[PDB]
């Protein structure tokens, strides 16, 4: 981190030029409020988890592929056919449409085919493996900081982005629980409790999620995409729009869960704000 | 103890 | 022969098969050296999940083959 | 891509050349000085990794060993016989790249490098291929070959160019393909270690910028085996490295058959040879 | 106690040892059941290469736990 | 040989 010698526009066009370089849909950035050039330039962005020590990544002994089509892939109208849906254990409907959005119906748990699958890549149940779609314009907030929105108009269940970063152990997480500023961009993978046991972290490494701010009323909500459907402690944390966005809106989501029957001042400005995301 | 949360399963999150 | 059951906890179970023992056997025999009920059993082999209705030997499984064992959850 | 409407000239160059922009790492741009095809096949997506498919075992992390050079301070180069990945090298350790990055002219034909269970962080020295293209790459018509690639900047030999990447198939798989023998072929076996010769990388429907290398019986750019995981050899990176110095817009090309033997004097298949090489084999086998 | 060793080709090896026991003699012990010479072997547990000299229980190996055993390049 | 690309194998190297 040197950055004294880089002017304002030196620093914006380097931040341009990590966006540039970032896998799929363009990612921009504007800023209409101050005079701030970009987010932290000792950021590098990834495509995909960055695993660390201690970190037990998934086995593939323990994976399973359904034998559905190799050319339509997977039949959204044939669930029962389809071998890794075999875990759910309920009327056991794709978590997707055929328009490849997320029913409004479908859990917190979706499941995916993986390489031992026989259907293409172009399969109704690979959505979060091809990536994004959406282009995000990254923009200063006003009492936020930095934040996304979104550029194209995206339905509800429309999948936007993985939140990416470095996978560590409860203890080296335990160790970075430094916010030093109300900066936070741990992650705890805490959706089975059986299992958890890891956190990824977003302040080195990460993707454009690692802006997405907290609301209490948001837009977006986090699913937790398995295609090692045998472990639960590392998955894919995939962003569905569960409400309509217009272009231009930023994109938020809840720092936590319902957790029903069970800075620090929260800027959103929802209806039912609580002054805390706590998160 | 301020760490981003899934807010487990346990919610259908729909 | 004999062959061996992976669990995600790093369990490992010997059983003593034949092969032409049926997956159903062998989760029989699960069954009764661990108390894992057939119906939760998934045991996989090669990337693919293991069938009733099919043998060891079907699956080209031979001696001191290693089969792996997830126990089938429902509400996460 | 529903194109039930015709596609123009222009419409397939565009789209080719979004494609391109959305490519992972520094820019791929597209030129065509020679006839009037818009761009390569528009039935093509670029992936950042491999795609593994049915039958196909991927690496096993449990025969995978880090090391621990964060107490040297992050896998240093001088000190090679304390890296733990060097453990299967040759009795001379050293890593396979110099200070500057670039693949040394010793090096062997594999490069062990670090992986996730190591103590060093990316920007550790051996982490050279994860972390992918620095080049700009064009992508140009040739003459008499179909497309060829070159680099906009100096390529100094021993740079990393990128990667071959693709579905990683069966010899089964690639049995029931293969029906491109009838004249371009985009498999690459992963035939490294003869002990471990089992897939094969096809780059037809899905892979990278490499997939538009040209063969060469005059090469500039070699492969090598990138091993992350060195308890595995069915499964690793194909690399790219530059075998001698890449003036700017020079094609960059490889041997498809890679290494050639020294003892066997004796020991066409697709197409006359047309790479226009002094040495010219005449004779390109894939 | 009795400990496992999985290796590539999908075979699982059953070991007598004890926690005494130093990596060279495991590596003897798998030679003399398997016919594996002990400089081209590399035992792994846990994400780390066990070394020649040391014990078992240095690597808080305790009974029924699994190592994995990888065959050392040669060739070049 | 095939009509495939290969590396070559182990022992020849880079030339
Ligand atoms: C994961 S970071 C992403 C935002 C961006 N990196 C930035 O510069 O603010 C989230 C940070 O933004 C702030 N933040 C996020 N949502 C907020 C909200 N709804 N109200 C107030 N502050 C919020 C918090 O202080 C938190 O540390
Ligand atoms: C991986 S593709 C090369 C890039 C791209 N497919 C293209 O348009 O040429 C390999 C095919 O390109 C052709 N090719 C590659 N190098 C050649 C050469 N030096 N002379 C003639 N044809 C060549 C061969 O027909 C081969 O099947
Ligand atoms: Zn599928
Ligand atoms: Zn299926
Ligand atoms: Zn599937
Ligand atoms: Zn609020
Ligand atoms: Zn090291
Ligand atoms: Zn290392
Ligand atoms: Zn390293
Ligand atoms: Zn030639």
């Known amino acids: 981190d040197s950055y004294t010698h880089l002017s304002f526009y030196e620093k914006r066009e380097l931040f341009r030029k990590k966006l540039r370089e970032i896998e799929g849909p363009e990612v921009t950035l504007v800023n209409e409020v101050d005079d701030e050039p970009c987010p932290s330039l000792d950021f590098q962005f990834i495509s995909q988890y960055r695993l660390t020590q201690g970190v037990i990544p998934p086995d593939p002994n323990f994976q399973s592929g359904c034998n559905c089509s190799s050319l339509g892939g997977c039949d959204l109208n044939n669930p029962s056919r389809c071998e890794c849906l075999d875990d759910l254990d309920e009327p056991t409907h794709f978590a997707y449409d055929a328009q490849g959005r997320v029913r409004a119906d479908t859990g917190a748990v979706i499941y995916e085919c993986n390489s031992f699958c026989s259907c293409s890549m172009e399969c109704p149940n690979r959505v979060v493996q091809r990536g994004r779609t959406l282009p995000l314009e990254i923009f200063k907030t006003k009492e936020k900081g930095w934040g996304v929105r979104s550029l194209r108009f995206a339905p509800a269940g429309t999948f936007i982005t993985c939140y990416l970063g470095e996978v560590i152990t409860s203890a080296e997480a335990a160790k970075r629980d430094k916010n030093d500023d109300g900066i936070t961009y741990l992650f705890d993978l805490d959706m089975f409790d059986d299992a958890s046991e890891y956190t990824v972290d977003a302040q080195n490494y990460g993707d454009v999620s690692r802006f997405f701010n907290h609301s209490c009323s948001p837009n977006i909500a986090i699913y937790s995409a398995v295609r090692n459907h045998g472990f639960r402690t590392i998955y894919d944390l995939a962003f569905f729009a569960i409400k309509d966005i217009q272009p231009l809106e930023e994109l938020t989501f809840d720092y936590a869960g319902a957790k029903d029957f069970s800075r620090r001042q929260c800027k959103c400005g929802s209806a039912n704000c609580r002054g805390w995301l706590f998160g | ?14 | 022969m004999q062959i061996f059951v992976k669990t995600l906890t790093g369990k490992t179970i010997t059983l003593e098969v034949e092969p032409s023992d049926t997956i159903e056997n062998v989760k029989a025999k699960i069954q009764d050296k661990e108390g894992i009920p057939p119906d939760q059993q998934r045991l996989i082999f090669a990337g693919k999940q293991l069938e009733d209705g099919r043998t060891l030997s079907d699956y080209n499984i031979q001696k001191e083959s290693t089969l792996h064992l997830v126990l089938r959850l429902r509400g996460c």
């Open chain 2, 1 to 14: 103890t301020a760490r981003l949360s899934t807010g487990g399963c346990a919610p259908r999150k729909q």
